[PDB]
């Protein structure tokens, strides 16, 4: 069906939520730009942590070292993925930013991968993909600006809550702590 007021196909896709299906939305491998999807990154029944953001998104950069600490701590049982999305504060935008990063709004995958490479010159080999230029994953996960998720066997287990900067990472740590405790016992 077409929406008479848009001329576009009618949308029947429900927004992502905890306990609902994790969208198998499209992403891009930095090396070679091959198409992939979020669930290509799930390894069987291991939880997969998703971290959407960009270099010009301050809270995303402020938590990166903490996120990398989580990878080391939980990698025994959990997988992790960064999704590099549209810049929060592009250097050619309307609002002048004093972001330490000066990155024009991406106009192609070549621009976006260039930005992603700046990110990953820190964070030695975390898994990282790009969102498609249609922003397929950002849209499906409601994850523009930045967002954290945990998915497992195709279901959303943790959805990063909007609200003050600081909590999402502490809440994610809580989810991972409880999962690790269920598998192995409480750490002494």
From Swiss-Prot:
EC number in record: 1.21.99.3
Catalytic reactions of this protein: 3,3',5'-triiodo-L-thyronine + iodide + A + H(+) = L-thyroxine + AH2; 3,3'-diiodo-L-thyronine + iodide + A + H(+) = 3,3',5-triiodo-L-thyronine + AH2; 3-iodo-L-thyronine + iodide + A + H(+) = 3,5-diiodo-L-thyronine + AH2; L-thyronine + iodide + A + H(+) = 3-iodo-L-thyronine + AH2
Record-level GO BP terms: apoptotic process; brown fat cell proliferation; hormone biosynthetic process; positive regulation of multicellular organism growth; response to hypoxia; retinal cone cell apoptotic process; retinal cone cell development; thyroid hormone catabolic process
Cell compartments where the protein resides: Cell membrane; Endosome membrane
Gene Ontology molecular function terms on file: thyroxine 5'-deiodinase activity; thyroxine 5-deiodinase activity
Enzyme superclass (EC): oxidoreductase
GO CC annotation terms, alphabetical: endosome membrane; plasma membrane
Similarity-based family: Belongs to the iodothyronine deiodinase family.
Function, as annotated: Plays a crucial role in the metabolism of thyroid hormones (TH) and has specific roles in TH activation and inactivation by deiodination. Catalyzes the deiodination of L-thyroxine (T4) to 3,3',5'-triiodothyronine (rT3), 3,5,3'-triiodothyronine (T3) to 3,3'-diiodothyronine (3,3'-T2), 3,5-diiodothyronine (3,5-T2) to 3-monoiodothyronine (3-T1), rT3 to 3',5'-diiodothyronine (3',5'-T2) and 3,3'-T2 to 3'-monoiodothyronine (3'-T1) via inner-ring deiodination (IRD). Catalyzes the deiodination of 3-T1 to L-thyronine (T0) via outer-ring deiodination (ORD).
Name the record gives this protein: Thyroxine 5-deiodinase
Gene: Dio3
